[PDB]
């Protein structure tokens, strides 16, 4: 295909992903393995605007900065099968730099990941997905941001998060596994000495001595703002509720993490409406039917989507 995953234009972070996976690929070698392929296909400069009652409290009273600026990516994994390209995984992260205000500096945080089960071999999916996940941790850690922020709700019954339709038979895993599955993604990276230690978020604002609202990170489409406004010590309660959910990592730790120079991002911006978040790409697979559900599907509804991809205005 002209229209290749492959094709598509490479960036530092795509490249460090699809190297650290397709390296376990080749160390596990195993005979139905094919080579993955991790594309950015957005990245944008946005701002989180701090809602109204937070603002009124502590934004109007010089205790808070207004916004924080952060860069959105979206990267896709996809792996040949048959010479033809699957797409079986997709993140969109938000990353707040070394010149976003406090308490938000050096942060990032993943808004939404997803998957589609056809990797092939079965038995190294999850293994991938850890890889390019750690992965991320690792690059992210190498250009001086300090924590990690992940959300493990899975989704309710018939939502998808990024891919339209998923196959009948992918079990959605209920909190209780998905939780482990993070943790045992975090447990290979404390091993790799990539992420120095984790915790959930009521037990991290404790080690913090947070007494303040204005103190925890406030990011786009999160949990914790929306919390915030409604209950404009009840938020100590409503963190050791949901406690189990977050997971806050923190990749430099001490000393190290004061003294280090600003973040330098080598890549560009992309811009990519249908990328732009993950809404414009479910309205495009839920109005041309590009659904993920049996293999067959999914790799049409993959090459639909990579020429998208190459001939966006
Ligand atoms: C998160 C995700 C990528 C992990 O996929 P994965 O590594 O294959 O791990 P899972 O926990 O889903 O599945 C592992 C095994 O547990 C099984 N399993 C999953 N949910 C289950 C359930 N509710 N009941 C019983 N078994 C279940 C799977 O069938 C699979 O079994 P197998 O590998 O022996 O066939 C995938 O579940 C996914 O895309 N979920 C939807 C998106 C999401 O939850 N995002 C969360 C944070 S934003
Ligand atoms: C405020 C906060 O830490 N939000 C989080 C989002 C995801 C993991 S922790």
Redesign the pocket.
Request: positive net charge; contains cysteine; proline residues 13%.
């Given at each position: 295909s002209k229209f290749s995953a492959k094709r598509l234009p490479s960036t530092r972070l795509g490249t460090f992903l699809e190297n650290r996976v397709n390296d376990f690929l080749r160390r596990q070698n195993h005979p139905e393995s094919g080579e993955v392929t991790v594309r950015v296909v957005h990245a944008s400069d946005k701002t989180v605007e701090v809602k109204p009652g937070m603002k009124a409290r502590f934004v109007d009273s010089g205790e808070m900065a207004e916004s924080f600026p952060y860069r959105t990516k979206a990267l896709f994994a996809f792996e040949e099968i048959d010479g033809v390209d699957l797409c079986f995984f997709g993140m969109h992260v938000q990353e707040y730099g070394s010149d976003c205000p406090p308490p938000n500096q050096r942060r990032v945080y993943?808004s939404?990941?997803?998957?589609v089960?056809f990797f092939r071999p079965?038995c190294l999916?999850?293994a991938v997905?850890h890889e390019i996940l750690i992965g991320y941790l690792e690059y992210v850690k190498k250009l001086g941001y300090t924590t990690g922020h992940i959300?493990?709700?899975?989704?309710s019954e018939g939502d998808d998060?990024i891919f339209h339709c998923h196959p009948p038979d992918q079990?959605?895993?209920?909190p209780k596994?998905?939780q482990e599955?993070f943790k045992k993604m975090l447990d290979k990276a404390v091993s790799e000495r990539i992420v120095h230690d984790y915790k959930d978020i009521f037990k991290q604002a404790t080690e913090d001595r947070l007494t303040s609202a204005k103190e925890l990170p406030y990011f786009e489409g999160d949990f914790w703002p929306n919390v915030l406004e409604e209950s404009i010590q009840k938020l100590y309660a409503t963190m050791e509720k949901h406690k189990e959910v977050f997971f806050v990592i923190r990749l430099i730790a001490g000393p190290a993490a004061n003294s280090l120079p600003p973040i330098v991002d080598p890549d560009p911006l992309i811009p990519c409406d249908l990328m732009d978040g993950r809404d414009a790409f479910l309205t495009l697979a839920r109005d041309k039917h590009l659904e993920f559900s049996s293999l067959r599907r999914a790799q049409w509804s993959t090459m639909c989507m990579l020429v998208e991809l190459h001939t966006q205005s």
């Open positions: 993943i939404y990941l997803d998957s089960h079965k999916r999850t997905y959300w493990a709700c899975p989704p998060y079990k959605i895993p209920k596994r998905l599955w």
